[PDB]
Amino acid sequence: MTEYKLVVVGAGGVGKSALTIQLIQNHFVEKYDPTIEDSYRKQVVIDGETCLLDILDTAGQEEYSAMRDQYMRTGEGFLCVFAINNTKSFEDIHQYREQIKRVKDSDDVPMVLVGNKCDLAARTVESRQAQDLARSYGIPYIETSAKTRQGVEDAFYTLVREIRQH
């Protein structure tokens, strides 16, 4: 099978680990355990192709910012995650887009914009503003809930599709 190197990035607490663990283990992590950097290997079937996903779940906390160049070099596609009830996380997205573009020296690195925690009622980031940002970058926008599992497969599978069409 072909292998895909996926990296999950975004501000601390947006649900990067929760999304990853929903894909890997098929359950929701309620606990908030800040990540330093974790990696996963998951075999999947996407549109009839068997794929090995190597998934890097990264730190949103600033103390680990120095690790970014390293993982941005090696990653093939990026899930750029914010939480729809956290305006600051949405503001932080462009910073990730820009650092990836710098490190990889490309303006079309495979990326998906993910608005997570869509199970929550108290939304502060309007879907239209997120759709606008994704359109600006030329990338897909998907809302997910690591809790309900809504959009989780679509987010990762869309990213793999973005990579294999690149």
Partner: protein, 133 residues
């Protein structure tokens, strides 16, 4: 479940997607012979001069349509000189279920070559793995 002519056509299709010396061959009354690969992923207890050493191997075997999972397991344990209780081991097919690739334990009475033929040559679709409980 299935027709012999069905098996004949299945073998011909299989063989078009495979090298000649690795193809299946039709025999008497819908029996056939052919090849499988089994991935052994075992931890072997070792003594120094506790500790284990990995056995990570893919063994290619020539078998028939009547060769059972039980026969495949015993043959591998003997070939790799594994002395543990054979009933501590199981053969799994790695297959697609629900967008997920899962490992399903095989019945000791199952026929791996039949599974191989039905799946086609691609190990991405079906692979066999031998594991200790």
């Amino acid at each position: 479940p299935p027709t012999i002519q069905e098996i004949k056509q299945k073998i011909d299709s299989y063989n078009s997607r495979e090298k000649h010396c690795l193809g299946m061959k039709l025999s008497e009354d819908g029996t056939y012979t052919g090849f499988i690969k089994v991935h052994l992923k075992l931890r072997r207890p070792v003594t120094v001069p506790s500790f284990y050493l990995p056995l990570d191997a893919i063994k290619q075997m020539h078998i028939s349509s009547t060769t059972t999972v039980s026969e495949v397991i015993q043959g591998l344990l003997d070939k790799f000189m594994v002395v543990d209780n054979p009933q501590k081991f199981a053969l799994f097919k790695r297959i697609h279920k629900d967008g997920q690739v899962l490992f399903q334990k095989l019945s000791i009475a199952d026929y791996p070559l039949y599974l191989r033929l039905l799946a086609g040559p691609d190990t991405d679709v079906l692979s066999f793995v031998l594991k200790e409980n």
